[PDB]
Write an enzyme that holds these catalytic residues in place. Structure first.
Site, mmCIF file in Angstrom:
data_model
loop_
_atom_site.group_PDB
_atom_site.id
_atom_site.type_symbol
_atom_site.label_atom_id
_atom_site.label_comp_id
_atom_site.label_asym_id
_atom_site.label_seq_id
_atom_site.Cartn_x
_atom_site.Cartn_y
_atom_site.Cartn_z
ATOM 1 N N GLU A 147 6.397 -12.157 1.275
ATOM 2 C CA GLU A 147 6.594 -11.205 0.223
ATOM 3 C C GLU A 147 7.855 -10.422 0.477
ATOM 4 O OE1 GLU A 147 2.559 -9.273 -0.371
ATOM 5 O OE2 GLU A 147 1.967 -10.738 1.136
ATOM 6 N N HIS B 9 -0.853 -2.855 -4.444
ATOM 7 C CA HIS B 9 -0.249 -3.716 -5.450
ATOM 8 C C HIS B 9 -0.285 -3.155 -6.869
ATOM 9 C CE1 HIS B 9 0.434 -6.257 -2.221
ATOM 10 N NE2 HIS B 9 -0.761 -6.862 -2.180
ATOM 11 N N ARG C 158 0.797 -1.237 0.000
ATOM 12 C CA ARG C 158 0.000 0.000 0.000
ATOM 13 C C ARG C 158 0.830 1.289 0.000
ATOM 14 N NH1 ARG C 158 -2.444 -4.084 2.793
ATOM 15 N NH2 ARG C 158 -4.583 -4.422 2.053
ATOM 16 N N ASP D 270 -0.070 -9.403 9.121
ATOM 17 C CA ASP D 270 -0.172 -8.728 7.851
ATOM 18 C C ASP D 270 0.814 -7.572 7.923
ATOM 19 O OD1 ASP D 270 -0.822 -7.963 5.334
ATOM 20 O OD2 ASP D 270 -2.913 -7.474 5.824
ATOM 21 N N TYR E 247 1.358 -18.200 -1.553
ATOM 22 C CA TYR E 247 0.857 -18.522 -0.258
ATOM 23 C C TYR E 247 1.249 -19.954 -0.015
ATOM 24 C CZ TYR E 247 -2.658 -14.735 -0.088
ATOM 25 O OH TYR E 247 -3.274 -13.491 -0.041
ATOM 26 N N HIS F 16 3.849 -13.230 -4.808
ATOM 27 C CA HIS F 16 2.788 -13.422 -3.850
ATOM 28 C C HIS F 16 2.298 -14.838 -3.582
ATOM 29 C CE1 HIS F 16 -0.722 -12.237 -1.519
ATOM 30 N NE2 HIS F 16 -0.315 -10.958 -1.547
#
Ligand code: FUC
Ligand code: FUC
Ligand code: NA
Lengths: 346, 339
Positions: free
Chosen positions: A303, A95, A70, A242, A171, A169
């Protein structure tokens, strides 16, 4: 062995199998990893067709940019000039803006080196795309070798001074099932500090906080449940993790992080200064992965990039990219078996 | 039948064969026509792989835009405001600027209707791309049917007021070989006026000229060599034809143009007001097509769209696209064989 086939909407699926029998696959839609399997078990989250990505969630395993994370109010300062980028999350640019690189079909070429196979994806971000000065010629090379190392190498050159700080990205979920929480995984992370978020909008608070000895301290391996169960303000704010973690020691040579489940471990190496970790704090959304409803905490990212918020916390770094200057970044995820003894129960 | 294959660099080649045995093929690289053949003969110009287009010439068969043609100084006025677009030909913005939509891989979906097959290509032009306000969600549907009709239907929606006037840039050559001039083809064209060019920069001159009874009058079928051997200053200027012709009657039902060679003819239908005709005036360039060196005049286009130059000659039309408005356009290329 290398195999290619249509993956839907015009995208292709490139599947590699190394000498050890480990398979990994990518797609040109978003220069993305789609799957990684060992003995029939998925080590990451992914979908079965291109359409699923576009309809369910376009971030998983993708290459995101030009700037990852962001940017408060979409505002950046480039060579003394203020520029406003596309704002796709409230007034924030997340992003790279709407319909960014993760949604495009990149061109690609495969190079077989025997013990290593490289898949080089290319794309040009035109000058002005989403507010970014350019044009930017980008390339992402994903490679996999006989030693079970999946490496990502980024390269870019801009015609104009701009900003650049992409990330991968993926996971992971060593349970091989989205419906199973990663709270049962062990995490080791070489970081003593983190970047707190201001609030629900998730922009940075403005300060760097030391986390030694708190529930977010993973210098010494601990179960992820320790963080998830934490009532620390920051954990409660996002309902998991996060955040950007600041690596204590830089260098591609050091194991910055390690994620383990039983006899399987994934080690993370990178030349970048931080690692944003997001633990799929989706609540009851339940996106379906292979017909399994994903659970809250049903995955974790690593990330690697320059930490988001440098616009407000200059100490984090500088993501500016000068015209003609060549950008490069390298991140590596390596798979190991029986690296350590991890025998727990949840 | 439908056949999909890898065309290089991750692009696909989609080939359609109708009941008549005619084959037409497209690629998602630039939502473009690659080949069109009958009885083993190529009707249009095209390459054999994606790489060729990128290294030799990216325009042939492509969908070009957002704005087709040349824009003086890259300048457009949108809602009373000046906007500078990417300049890729001197100070002009030609065919949307550098690395435009013709060089991108579009996503696509094939729809088999039996007598007709449709290939719908989609792409999003982000807001600000090459200077253009957006985002513009675009779709180009190429379809082929048992009647030998190749149709192109464009649609677009923009989040912001912008400009939009794309075209299809296929080059025809009924000789089926690039090393052979199209001077032998006959052309008919329902246009009484044309838009002269200023000079070698190819920007418009400023005026609209009546061509009735000149070497450019094709209201009555005529052979291309005529125009080619003309001494009209405009012909001499570009060494052939490279101009917008204004259609006399608008509407999709009317055959606007016809390209003929012997038994074989191509009819052009469109809902656009103009047709830019360019006769591959490349001199000795010699681009290689199927191993054949291209000759000056080795191809001809029928770029249907709003004529370029409206920035200086308002009468030509207006290419603005207001936010939320749906843009639509249709162009048809119909193949006929005399029996
Ligand atoms: C899609 C996710 O990507 C990153 O991990 C962000 O930090 C998360 O908040 C979410 O936006
Ligand atoms: C590639 C070609 O496209 C159009 O036909 C232009 O008018 C020609 O001058 C040339 O630029
Ligand atoms: Na393909």
């Amino acid at each position: 062995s290398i195999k290619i086939r249509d993956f839907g909407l015009g995208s292709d699926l490139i599947s590699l199998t190394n000498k050890a029998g480990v398979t990994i696959s990518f797609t040109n839609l978003g220069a993305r990893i789609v799957d990684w399997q060992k003995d029939g078990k998925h080590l990451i989250l992914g979908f079965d067709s291109a359409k699923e990505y576009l309809e369910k969630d376009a971030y998983p395993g993708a290459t995101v940019g030009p700037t990852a994370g962001r940017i408060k109010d979409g505002l950046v300062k480039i060579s003394g000039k203020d520029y406003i980028l596309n704002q796709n999350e409230g007034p924030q640019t997340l992003h790279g803006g709407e319909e960014s690189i993760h949604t495009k079909l990149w061109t690609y070429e495969v190079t077989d080196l025997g013990a290593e196979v490289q898949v080089k994806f290319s794309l040009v971000s035109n000058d002005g795309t989403n507010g970014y000065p350019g044009k930017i010629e980008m390339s992402v090379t994903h490679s996999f070798d006989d030693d079970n190392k999946w490496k990502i190498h980024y390269e870019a050159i801009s015609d104009k001074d701009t900003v650049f700080n992409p990330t991968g990205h993926v996971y992971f979920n060593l349970n091989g099932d989205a419906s199973e929480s990663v709270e049962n995984h062990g995490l080791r992370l070489a970081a003593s500090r983190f970047v707190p978020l201001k609030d629900q909008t998730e922009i940075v608070r403005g300060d760097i906080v030391d986390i030694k000895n708190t529930d977010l301290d993973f210098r010494q391996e601990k179960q992820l449940s320790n963080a998830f169960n934490s009532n620390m303000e920051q954990v409660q704010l996002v309902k998991g993790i996060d955040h950007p973690f600041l690596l204590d020691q830089l260098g591609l040579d050091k194991e910055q992080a390690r994620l383990t489940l039983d006899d399987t471990s994934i080690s993370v190496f990178t030349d970048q200064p931080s690692i944003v970790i997001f633990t799929a704090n989706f609540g009851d959304l339940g996106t379906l992965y292979h017909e399994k409803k994903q659970v809250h905490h049903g995955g974790i990212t690593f990330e690697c990039q320059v930490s988001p918020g440098s616009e407000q916390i200059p100490e984090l770094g500088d993501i500016s990219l000068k015209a003609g200057e060549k950008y490069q970044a390298t991140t590596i995820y390596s798979l190991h078996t029986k690296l350590e003894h991890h025998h727990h129960h949840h």
